[PDB]
Amino acid sequence: NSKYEYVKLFEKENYLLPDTYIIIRVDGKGFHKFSQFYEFEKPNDLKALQVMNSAAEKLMSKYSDVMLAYGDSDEYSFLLRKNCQLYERREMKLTTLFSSLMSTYYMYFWSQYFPDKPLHIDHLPNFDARAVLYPDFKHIRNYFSWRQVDCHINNLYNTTFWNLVLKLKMTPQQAEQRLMGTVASDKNEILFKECGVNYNNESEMYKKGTIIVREFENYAELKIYHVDIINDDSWWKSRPWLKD
Amino acid sequence: SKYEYVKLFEKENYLLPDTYIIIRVDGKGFHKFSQFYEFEKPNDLKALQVMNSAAEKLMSKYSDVMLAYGDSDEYSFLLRKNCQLYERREMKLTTLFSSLMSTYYMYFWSQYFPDKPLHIDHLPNFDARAVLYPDFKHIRNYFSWRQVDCHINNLYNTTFWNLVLKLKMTPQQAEQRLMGTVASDKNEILFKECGVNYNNESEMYKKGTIIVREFENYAELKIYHVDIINDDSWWKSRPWLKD
Amino acid sequence: SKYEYVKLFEKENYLLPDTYIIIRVDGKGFHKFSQFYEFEKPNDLKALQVMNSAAEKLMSKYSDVMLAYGDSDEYSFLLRKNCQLYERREMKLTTLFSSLMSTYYMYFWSQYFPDKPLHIDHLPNFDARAVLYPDFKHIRNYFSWRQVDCHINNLYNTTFWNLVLKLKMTPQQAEQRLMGTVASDKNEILFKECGVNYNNESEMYKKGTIIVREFENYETEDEAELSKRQVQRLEKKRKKAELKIYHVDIINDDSWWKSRPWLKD
Amino acid sequence: NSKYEYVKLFEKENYLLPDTYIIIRVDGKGFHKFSQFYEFEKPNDLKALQVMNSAAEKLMSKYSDVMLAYGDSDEYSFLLRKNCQLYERREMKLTTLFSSLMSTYYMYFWSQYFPDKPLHIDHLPNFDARAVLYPDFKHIRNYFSWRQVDCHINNLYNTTFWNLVLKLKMTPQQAEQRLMGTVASDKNEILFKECGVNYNNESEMYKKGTIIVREFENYETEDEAELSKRQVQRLEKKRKKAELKIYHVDIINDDSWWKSRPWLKD
Ligand SMILES: Nc1ncnc2c1ncn2[C@@H]1O[C@H](COP(=O)(O)OP(=O)(O)OP(=O)(O)O)[C@@H](O)[C@H]1O
Ligand SMILES: Nc1ncnc2c1ncn2[C@@H]1O[C@H](COP(=O)(O)OP(=O)(O)OP(=O)(O)O)[C@@H](O)[C@H]1O
Ligand SMILES: Nc1ncnc2c1ncn2[C@@H]1O[C@H](COP(=O)(O)OP(=O)(O)OP(=O)(O)O)[C@@H](O)[C@H]1O
Ligand SMILES: Nc1ncnc2c1ncn2[C@@H]1O[C@H](COP(=O)(O)OP(=O)(O)OP(=O)(O)O)[C@@H](O)[C@H]1O
Ligand SMILES: Nc1ncnc2c1ncn2[C@@H]1O[C@H](COP(=O)(O)OP(=O)(O)OP(=O)(O)O)[C@@H](O)[C@H]1O
Ligand SMILES: Nc1ncnc2c1ncn2[C@@H]1O[C@H](COP(=O)(O)OP(=O)(O)OP(=O)(O)O)[C@@H](O)[C@H]1O
Ligand SMILES: Nc1ncnc2c1ncn2[C@@H]1O[C@H](COP(=O)(O)OP(=O)(O)OP(=O)(O)O)[C@@H](O)[C@H]1O
Ligand SMILES: Nc1ncnc2c1ncn2[C@@H]1O[C@H](COP(=O)(O)OP(=O)(O)OP(=O)(O)O)[C@@H](O)[C@H]1O
Ligand SMILES: [Mg+2]
Ligand SMILES: [Mg+2]
Ligand SMILES: [Mg+2]
Ligand SMILES: [Mg+2]
Ligand SMILES: [Mg+2]
Ligand SMILES: [Mg+2]
Ligand SMILES: [Mg+2]
Ligand SMILES: [Mg+2]
Ligand SMILES: [Mg+2]
Ligand SMILES: [Mg+2]
Ligand SMILES: [Mg+2]
Ligand SMILES: [Mg+2]
């Protein structure tokens, strides 16, 4: 009975520092293999991104403390307002519930968008999740800038890579050697001149990723954007509730 | 890069080496979940079969899991003390387990309840926590703790719902009858007042579920519904749980 | 080496970057300690001067310390938010501060109380804890918290010991006399029964002690681009600026904080 | 008061995992410079080590949870029994108390051993202190082995270095360049063949360090949840009033030394 419950004293809770912005980032586990197994289109599978986006928006609509979400590829980052008391700011609760939620929402929406690709039990969509604290909103701006810069680099690379492979019939291995050394202008030239692709004409979602933001009128409703957030300061300034 | 410094704000937790790790998952809002999908009360057999299939599948994927114990909407997994899965990072281990149990549950649900398709607002989610134990006797006491808790809670729920269904008590009147009572009292209340013999309840409901890796010439996963609190020989004949 | 793996069991705690750090040290068993060396009651001036000398000395050695507040057997130190002392290691920051205050206290004690050599079973020990605050408004409220506490404990102790020393009550009956009492009552007890006006007590006893780094020609001149020899000059001025001591209200006087912008930066 | 006390909620305590061995290691801050300022004898200053040993033994006689201590140079490691509840196993409390205790005990004993070299305010003996958890006693064995091997390595280097400088009248740079590359056996010969010094003739304390142990005579091992209340208190009494013995011996390779002291494991 009560002779075993002392083992409860070995648990250690981690209460995240109060009045600090929390970022929760989730990223698909082994999604390179996952995207091969389910034959994702390359470089970008549109419906696969729409599954991520439905999952993230659904989560965000469940927790009014999530003010802003940014996603691309197999990742999503969620901004929690600094006065968030969700699960008393317990790190274990916030992170394992977020990876659990994204996982199950992903499975739900996958069966909707891909009815002909039923999930195999050895290839279920799993996510990790980590919480990071940022004490000042300038780090929050820089964080999302970090994630959008990364979206740019990876999409430009992948779009070039997969066009070398699919249009020029290169194998993945010869595509990589072709790109070693190349800078951004080079990849652009290769896409236009060799593959007949104008990179600037790629979908805004592929190039910029996806922003889900909570909108307030008399400072709520969820709106989705595919825009620059790195250099457009007015985008943030007209949204002061992201900071409060 | 001018933005990547933000990575330096991340803080990892590497769990103390050479210590046993328990990962415990527990269903999020499973009161509501069990009502929405019209689970049988006090215990739903097929729901438990879904948990057990999920846990067995996870365990068959991760050779570091030596033992699992489940009852109700929870499961505990023992990782061997020299486990190096994700370099023993707490963030990785716990979010992987909550993600794994969640999706395995969704997968197995559709096998066991083809007639109860999952609703977008009622998916099976789990939390997950890691606990360190520096000595195997604490691992023994840990699984004893969970099994005793299975007993206490199964007794409570079985008694409560039979007071309501057999004696036609209201929820408050049943709660009022149970105030103060200890386990032997609840067992007696069931027999004498509700006409239910608790000892005849299913062993799974009473004892919970143990999944253990069996080695012969010290592998196979075997499922048990047996006492592990007082049977020292059950543990003693399985030294690989310690090692 | 076959034994050095044991180093891997150590766990460092690097305090979150860009946040204010408060270190609070507090004397271990200073009730018993102040009895053993027969401190004057309610306040021993020279014992407080020993604490203030220790804190001023520590602060003169570590330019990241921007502000210190003390009373009784405690001192709190504000580290600027971009402090990199020991790479923000919690273990290093706290045990250094408890060690420093302990040794500075023993040194200054032998200067101020040459006739009371310290006994080996009653050495002055301090704990020390680091606390993070993500916004400067929390730093203001933190120091308000400590100054409100200084007021409360000093009003109680002054009433208590005047009941004992002037009215010849035993400690326990003085304690019972004060059970239930609120602030105006303690004030009345002191005035009407003991002939002491609490408002006439020393500012140091009532308000505590503030040690602040003072800068003269300060502009928030710091940004990531400016570097090299400019930064060394900013660092040099922080070392060779003057520590001023105050016994003033810092709870409600915003202009005191407002005219000292380098505390936030 | 009530509107400001919320700031208390930002504090984060670290409760060290129950029932695991705790090692607290303290090491003197900047004792290289400290040893030069007060003109420590080189390679080893006997009275300086005696100040450390007195400090450690006094601490150890004050805290019955400390079962074993090992010191050499400017460091000491203290072993806490597994069931130690000193300050509820709070890491902030355990560590800042130890760095504080060692610092003040050192200052105290220094004035006993060095009455003519009073401590200067810019050269006080300060210590850091860290707590480390070890879940199995074999790691405790290896920890103290680790520290004694380190003691051997540093004493041998320092003995060779200072004999080259002080006897052979070498400059610091060449003594240092002379030792680059050398292993223990090389150092042993430079001392013997070139300095006429037999390293084994050095004091055992310098070579082996200092072990301080709590000794029990009529010890039987039983430690359990069942025994409680005042029963725990006599075991506390036995532990508080037990003898501290000092040794300067190998503990790396001597299994019988440990096996005959089973109370260290509890
Ligand atoms: N402080 C405690 N002391 C002893 N037992 C506890 C304590 N808190 C919870 N328990 C028990 O431990 C078991 C594990 O459940 P769990 O830890 O999820 O409790 P909970 O209240 O849901 O807490 P959490 O918020 O951590 O999920 C429960 O049966 C519960 O009764
Ligand atoms: N919508 C998509 N369309 C096409 N490919 C995708 C899509 N989403 C993900 N991928 C593939 O999944 C990969 C995710 O890369 P990531 O850096 O997360 O590695 P990972 O395989 O998920 O490994 P990890 O377990 O370390 O996260 C991408 O490189 C791409 O190969
Ligand atoms: N040490 C680092 N410094 C800067 N950026 C990094 C570092 N490690 C990873 N990144 C980048 O951070 C982004 C987030 O990836 P993530 O945090 O999942 O890292 P990872 O390398 O997969 O490690 P893990 O998932 O094991 O923590 C990725 O774009 C990755 O390229
Ligand atoms: N197999 C099952 N049959 C019947 N009921 C079940 C079953 N599994 C779970 N439940 C119901 O779900 C509840 C889960 O209890 P728990 O204390 O975990 O509450 P919860 O709603 O899941 O809250 P939390 O989110 O804090 O875990 C049980 O008390 C029971 O009512
Ligand atoms: N990364 C490491 N790996 C193995 N041994 C180390 C390492 N760092 C230090 N040591 C050794 O550990 C012993 C204890 O020294 P200590 O723990 O004080 O570390 P340190 O290097 O002084 O750094 P700090 O005191 O800042 O943690 C010393 O003998 C040192 O040589
Ligand atoms: N300058 C002084 N004059 C007279 N007495 C003092 C002075 N400074 C400290 N004291 C005594 O020391 C006490 C310090 O109180 P505190 O609340 O820190 O308790 P403590 O005995 O130090 O216990 P702890 O170990 O929890 O800090 C005061 O109550 C006061 O009696
Ligand atoms: N839980 C609490 N909430 C608010 N104030 C507290 C709390 N505990 C202590 N305090 C107050 O905080 C001030 C600082 O004292 P300190 O931080 O040393 O705490 P303590 O109660 O002595 O416990 P410890 O020093 O062991 O952490 C004192 O005024 C004390 O009365
Ligand atoms: N008893 C002693 N006799 C002679 N020299 C000593 C003695 N104790 C300490 N020292 C000197 O103090 C030094 C302590 O070495 P340690 O590695 O701790 O460096 P430190 O200068 O104290 O730096 P840190 O602050 O990182 O500890 C030794 O190298 C030696 O020079
Ligand atoms: Mg990753
Ligand atoms: Mg991934
Ligand atoms: Mg990714
Ligand atoms: Mg729970
Ligand atoms: Mg649950
Ligand atoms: Mg539960
Ligand atoms: Mg205290
Ligand atoms: Mg005190
Ligand atoms: Mg105090
Ligand atoms: Mg060191
Ligand atoms: Mg040192
Ligand atoms: Mg040293």
A89 chain-D contacts, CB cut-off 8 A: none
With a CB cutoff of 8 Å and minimum separation 6, the contacts of B71 are B48, B146, B147, B149, B150, B153, B154, B208, B209
> Smallest Cβ distance to B128: which of A96, A125, A149?
A96
What's the gap in Å between C101 CA and the centre of ligand 16? 13
Angle at C258 between CA C255 and CA C264, to 5 degrees: 150
Alpha carbons A76 and A23: distance in angstroms, whole number: 10
Provide the token pair at D226: 């069942």
Task: Give the residue among C129, C126, C151, C122 at the shortest CA–CA distance from C252.
Answer: C151
Q: Is the CB of B7 under 6 A from ligand 3?
A: yes
Element (H, E) at C237: helix C229-239
What is the rounded distance in angstroms from the CA atom of residue A166 to the CA atom of residue A42? Answer: 9
User: What are the phi and psi torsion angles at A3 (to 5°)?
Assistant: -90, -5
Q: Is C254 exposed, middle or buried (0-12, 13-18, 19+ CB in 10 A)?
A: exposed
Residue with tokens 């508080």: D240
In whole angstroms, what is the distance from residue B221 CA to residue A62 CA?
A: 38
- The CATH architecture annotation of domain C1-265 reads 2-Layer Sandwich (3.30)
Amino acid at site B31:
H
Please list the alpha-helical segments (H only) found in A18-65.
Answer: 31-37, 46-62
Of all protein residues, whose CA lies closest to atom 28 belonging to ligand 1?
B149
Resolution in Å equals 2.4
Six-digit token string for D206: 């310098």
Distance in angstroms (rounded) separating the CA atoms of residues B138 and C212: 52
The experimental method behind these coordinates is X-ray
Q: How crowded is the C-beta side of C20, counted as CA atoms within 13 Å?
A: 25
Residue B15 C-alpha to ligand 2 middle, in angstroms? 28
d(CA D181, CA D190): 13
Please list, in sequence order, all residues whose beta carbon lies within 8 angstroms of the beta carbon of residue C20, skipping any fewer than 6 positions away: C78, C79, C80, C81, C132, C133, C134, C136, C138, C139
Rg of chain A, C-alpha, whole Å = 20
Contact D18 A10 (CB under 8 A): yes
Which ligand places an atom closest to the C-alpha of C24? 7
Question: What's the CA gap between A55 and A107, in Å, rounded?
Answer: 9
Q: How many CB atoms lie within 10 A of CB C132?
A: 22
Select the CATH number that applies to the domain covering A1-244 from these four: 1.10.3720.10, 3.30.70.580, 3.40.50.720, 3.30.70.3000: 3.30.70.3000
Nearest residue to C91 via CA among D129, D127, B11, D125: D129
Distance CA A181, CA C11 (A): 40
Give the C-alpha separation, D117 to B71, whole Å.
70
Cα→Cα distances C99→A27, B20, B46, D101, Å? 45, 36, 62, 8
Which of A3, A7, A8, A153 has the most B C-beta neighbours within 10 Å, making it the best mutation to test the interface with B? Answer: A7
Quote the CA–CA distance of C170 and C165 in Å, as a whole number: 9
For tokens 């061997």, name the residue: B80
Give the mutation target among D3, D4, D8, D92 for probing the ligand 7 site: most ligand atoms within 8 A of CB. Answer: D8
Q: Please tell me if residue C106 touches chain D, with a CB cutoff of 8 Å.
A: yes
* D10 close contact with A: CB closer than 8 A: yes
- Cα separation, B33 vs D112, in Å, equals 73
CA–CA distance, A127 with A99 (Å, rounded to integer)? 5
Ligand 2 atom nearest the C-alpha of A48 is: 1
Element (DSSP H or E) covering residue A24: strand A21-28
Looking at 3.40.50.720, 3.30.70.3000, 3.20.20.60, 3.90.380.10, the CATH number of the domain B1-243 comes to: 3.30.70.3000
Map tokens 């938010």 to a residue: C81
Q: Are A34 and A28 in contact (CB under 8 A)?
A: yes
* C25 close to C127: Cβ distance less than 8 angstroms: yes
Q: Which residue has the tokens 């502000």?
A: C67
Please count the other Cβ atoms lying within 10 Å of the Cβ belonging to residue D204.
13
Give me the residue from D3, D92, D104 closest to C129, CB to CB: D92
Instruction: Give how far B212 is from chain C: nearest CA, Å.
Output: 30
Its CATH architecture, for the domain D1-266, is 2-Layer Sandwich (3.30)
